[PDB]
């Protein structure tokens, strides 16, 4: 009894502090060693629990939920290889700056590295892929240890939510017996117990000298904004307003939110991946200033171009000093909040240093290429990869969420998803660009945004098929469009597709999986879209179905390259003739 | 020749970027594998070089120089155990937030973990004791690799200087031949080469909602400032002004600069370590708000007291989110720049919510205890430990630097160094409180502050005796006062001094070293102070000697406890009788 | 009392098991957090204690003691940077396979990574430089925890003594109070307590098929033994006997023991470093089989030669699978005990497959070069570096220990120390070849071997001058010969000595230290040897002095290269003319 009471007081002070620090959800995996942490978080009247038996799927589920809500999400698993399954989501959360509080149970010291069953060295388990690691003490209920448990609870959340955000790992060695005292409840009916650690909201700010320096050096310059994947509060309207004020184009990634923030503007460029391939056009586009926001864009033609830009002022806005610059072209590094920098320029830059011909050159190429793409997709009935993205852009409701898988789906959105006057929250795992856990990440984001849709390739869908168990047992609403080209279509473009001897076994891995059976395994409505009218009917059915939908579109891998190169050629020819 | 030219271009782009990022000094240790980095930094016309053959002493030398100048200092050593000798200074720089750029040469990949001579695994050599680690590529002079070398040069300094500051480690695998091309020079006479990465000055700022919350909750409260070891720009006058505006006492550590910033004030409390021992007095001192600045103070009576303060608002100002709170008593954590918080309250707090009786209670106990200490030291001729500190407080010139060793010297400054109207820059290694490398740290700080003095115990002086070689070969000016009590006097107070069986062998380690010979080994003027007049004459001689001075004062270890407890009792008796 | 009794039972079970596992000595550094471990090891009636206040010197002291006695030696230090000072000795013990049991005290969990005084992250402190790491639990005296403490005590020693031997690290978080119960004694007067874990002696053995394979492929081959630094039991006579049986030369490093095992033989080659420089001679020396023992030899001419040997069978004997092969020339890797392989060939190889002309070619070049060196040193009166080694070879008593420093001293022994019919145990730190801690390592080895001598350069002597404090307080007997060339003489041979602009500041670091004062600081008899007769008289005085002796010989750095190249030329000319 004394042992169980110590175990209860120790974890109650830690769990209550997680809730008071802003944790609302906890994704738990079943286990015997994690029993005291799992039971008490379920007993907590505010913490919402999601139980996932696949630890790999559970990690990405919590990852998507945190990525969509900007909220710190708790993960719990038992000792052993269950904690090793968190590594893909932890590495992705570290490179994408997602606040995951990873709690892993462990054997006590007497059962560590002694060959005990379900025992594993978990000290610094994730290496440098967490912002901080803590090996908690064995449960003690003394005054200093109860305040030590609350201290680490507030510290874990604060370090995870501190810019640059990222995952934190806490290891809990737990000694048997493992059943705490839940009656009476350890969170409620405990008077004179509140001792919350309030954390104040802070943000980084440029000096007055730094502000004057950049305002002076950016006035009257032919500048270009490059906004890659970035998910901060708002920021979509302030970026457009500053670009209108300066007359600068915004090379906007699909994941920047600028292609679908609810309105149309004349500064967002969404065809750069297309026309930056043309050499005869880059002459008139050479800028003097480049100001980067967020991560690096998916566009590889946007890369290379920025890589060869010589004798320019290349600003990079990096609030956390993460130093994400894969081209190493940075000339001026800025470590301040993006919202602050946008406002501080909005009311300091001159209101009339706008070379109209500069923005006219970018918007001309962009709007001409934009309509050639929309023309080729409107006049086709073959449901090619680009057509799937085009019809999604047309059929998605306002205030809808769209999770985009890596590989071809994210690159096809960059090519075939122009700016539209609807609010579409777009997410993707762009830390390591892994095809793993995409289904769970979308399901976690479906807790926040509704209606939620997922554009994903076939290989990636198989990878995290287990995620769908969360959709089945929690009655979740998600519409999954599978671009089943039966293998890896990303490898038809890369130069390995010309050697046919070992292709289709090392790269284009054919699966021949009938996803209709997988849709039945997870209680999902299945539709095979063979025509444009069928794909429509399926999407319209998915809105009237509050549940899991799967819309498979079989495409041809060996025809993608020709379709994309035919479109890119028609764009280059038209833009070459422009004066 | 092509190999040597590649080696020259690669390192020149890296070294020039370190200089342009603010590096002015480089402490180098001799070695064959570090040849190309050592020769090129010496060839650089701006980088100043200090050569130290003891790598342990070299690390602490650079540590003191960075700690005194707020400048990022480069360390260079060769492959092998030479890099292992950096670990004490690196661990101290990490816990004390000092920007050290640790560069360690290494064997190329073909000579790594193959039993090669002077080869050692140096990947993540310092573990979590560096903010970042980089294993540089083998030298390449391609366009991308030359920009990669400059990129890491600017990144290393920026990450090290970014709050919370700390050391960074870069490993350089270097392949033979190792002699670069210095004629013509690779830094000058190289046109169209400037591509510096300018970093802008940023700082953290509280939100408007956070400012309003704290101003409201601190108005009219019986608050107390606790300023431990902190070395930021200025901050000494703003703290006193805010405390005068609010009527709050400042429990000021010696290393906070508030005991010697050039003026006298009526809010700094420098006797708390004395009177917080008395139980009958703490009744009238119980506060409602505690606002902490800097690290944790050396005073252990200031600890315990703050540890048992219940039902208070315990603010902790932590610009880097380092979470330094060994008592875990934090109620409100603040992650903003200290200067910003001081100003934002200076002009938001009410100018008239001052309970005069509150500050009167603290200053009464402080000024009475302050004069009892000064009376006991003025009326004594025995050169006890407290008397040495007292006479230093009287004889030090204005705008002088005083490095204080750990163990008893730092605690005797806290007891016997009241606030004085002189500007005395006080430093100490308070990250891990190691008695190692204190001499080198003082010598590094002597490059910045002059005249420089060092109060150090005998065991600590022996520990880093090799540091004095830097003073001999570089004609450095430092006056070292050795409190030779022949062992560890810190262990006479702790409860291990009552068992005499194994004492004097495990704790009070007698050395019987005649430091007169050590002073001759390093070309230093030696003085043995036996009386107060002799200690004076020696200090006055040290100012007229531009060089190294060593003033030894032999004290009795077994009489320290009685002297300190007699003084503390006379203070407690007087303050008990106060109404 | 209950807390102190738990602390006593916990550590007593651990310390007693270290003693029963073969630990006889413990090198302790003073500290407050290490109080319970330090007091109890002193209380133990079998464990011998050495107290060293320099943790860096303490590590190398224990390193030398373990390297000389083949016994596992315990290190103890307090929490903080004191444990960081162990890193050079730990890295050297890992690369040289020395069984060090590194015990570091630590703060309890509530004081870990919270900014506590003298606190430092010590989890995996030494990274990959230890064979194993253990973070011990807080003291508990339950039945399972007392057996857990004994378990780790037996496991630490066993893992450290297991081939390949190496250091192990155990971290002890200790909570106050820290004073255990020593009266009554916790080791004696404790009936029904013996539960020792006996470890049986095991060794690796080749299969019958592996034995038949190598005996067949080595019969009648022109083979060569290469024995680098190796310190196993005996092995000196078995190697010579097998080489006599096969007719194979033994290219023997000075640290192989084959140049001074008590007798003269006709198979040990000690001039290879000299004559392998000559190109016209290597023609007749090309072998078919190379069998390597121990580490890689210091000779760089022995390197390169073995590196370009093509189409040979290069065997490497590696009992621990450490894979020490810096030339990567291995063709047949053998993971068995050296003694077993020597015997198994001694009685399986044919007794008559000896090409007399093969061994005659090696011994001819060796004996001619050997006498040219001895002639040049016998006919000179200038006390050059080679002459110092020559006179040491003549004046050292039988059954004497000689510690050799790195840099030039070890290379001068390889050149000027021919095989002699005296038993001279030669040691050196050849893991990383660091010039640090050489004095302490020699002093630790002086506990085992007597009389002990140390040949060391001036820079290396200064590096670990603090080691001499152990000689002063423990009345140790060691005769130190300092080859003071006032800087780094190793850099006059390397190709950096032709650029005089930055030489003598980066490589030849002149110190101008009068080591006579350092000898007085440590109560040592000092002699300056200016002639050959003076160096003799000093050595003869050192045998009649039971204590610390220091014999300084000032040499010229800028004349070493010419002296060595003149000798090497006279050898090459004579050996070129040989038929
Ligand atoms: C976890 C993971 N495994 C492997 C890869 C390598 N990879 C990149 S794209 C790709 C093909 C994925 O195919 P699919 O999801 O069907 O996309 P599409 O066919 O539309 O290109 C693979 C295996 C990866 N990025 N992440
Ligand atoms: C590197 C290091 N080793 C050991 C310790 C443990 N320690 C703390 S205080 C102390 C005594 C130092 O003695 P000294 O410098 O002479 O001071 P005083 O006698 O004035 O107390 C020791 C060994 C430490 N803090 N750092
Ligand atoms: C700890 C360490 N620091 C630096 C080096 C680089 N190093 C190799 S040899 C040498 C010179 C040492 O000089 P000394 O001991 O006087 O030898 P000698 O002059 O006889 O060559 C140095 C600094 C090293 N091997 N180990
Ligand atoms: Mg696919
Ligand atoms: Mg002392
Ligand atoms: Mg020398």
Numbering used by the authors:
A (entry chain A), B (entry chain A), C (entry chain A): 2 to 580
What did the original publication write about this model?
The ThDP-dependent enzyme 2-succinyl-5-enolpyruvyl-6-hydroxy-3-cyclohexene-1-carboxylate (SEPHCHC) synthase (MenD) catalyses the first irreversible step in bacterial classical menaquinone biosynthesis via a series of reactions involving covalent ThDP-bound intermediates. An important player in menaquinone production is the thiamine diphosphate (ThDP)-dependent decarboxylase MenD [2-succinyl-5-enolpyruvyl-6-hydroxy-3-cyclohexene-1-carboxylate (SEPHCHC) synthase]. MenD catalyses the first irreversible step of the classical menaquinone-biosynthesis pathway via two covalent ThDP intermediates; decarboxylation of 2-oxoglutarate produces intermediate I, with subsequent addition of isochorismate generating intermediate II and breakdown to release SEPHCHC. Analysis of the structures revealed that LmoMenD adopts the typical three-domain ThDP-dependent fold observed for MenD orthologs, while a combination of structure, size-exclusion chromatography, mass photometry and small-angle X-ray scattering analysis showed that the enzyme has a homotetrameric quaternary structure.
Analysis of the ThDP-bound LmoMenD structure suggests that the active-site configuration and ThDP-binding interactions are similar to those observed in other MenD enzymes. The ThDP diphosphate group tethers the cofactor to the enzyme via interactions with a divalent magnesium cation and the PP domain; specifically, residues Ser408, Met409, Asp459, Leu460 and Ser461, as well as Asn486 and Ile491, from the region that closes on the active site. The conserved residue Glu56 is likely to be involved in tautomerization of the aminopyrimidine ring during catalysis, and Ile436 is likely to be responsible for the bent ThDP conformation important for ThDP activation and catalysis, while Gln119 has speculative roles in many steps, including product release. Upon the application of crystallographic symmetry, a tetramer composed of a dimer of dimers is formed. Similarly, the ThDP-bound and intermediate I-bound structures (space group P6422) form the same dimer-of-dimers arrangement upon the application of crystallographic symmetry to the monomer present in the asymmetric unit. Comparison with a previously deposited but unpublished apo structure of LmoMenD revealed changes in key regions, resulting in a more closed active site in ligand-bound structures.
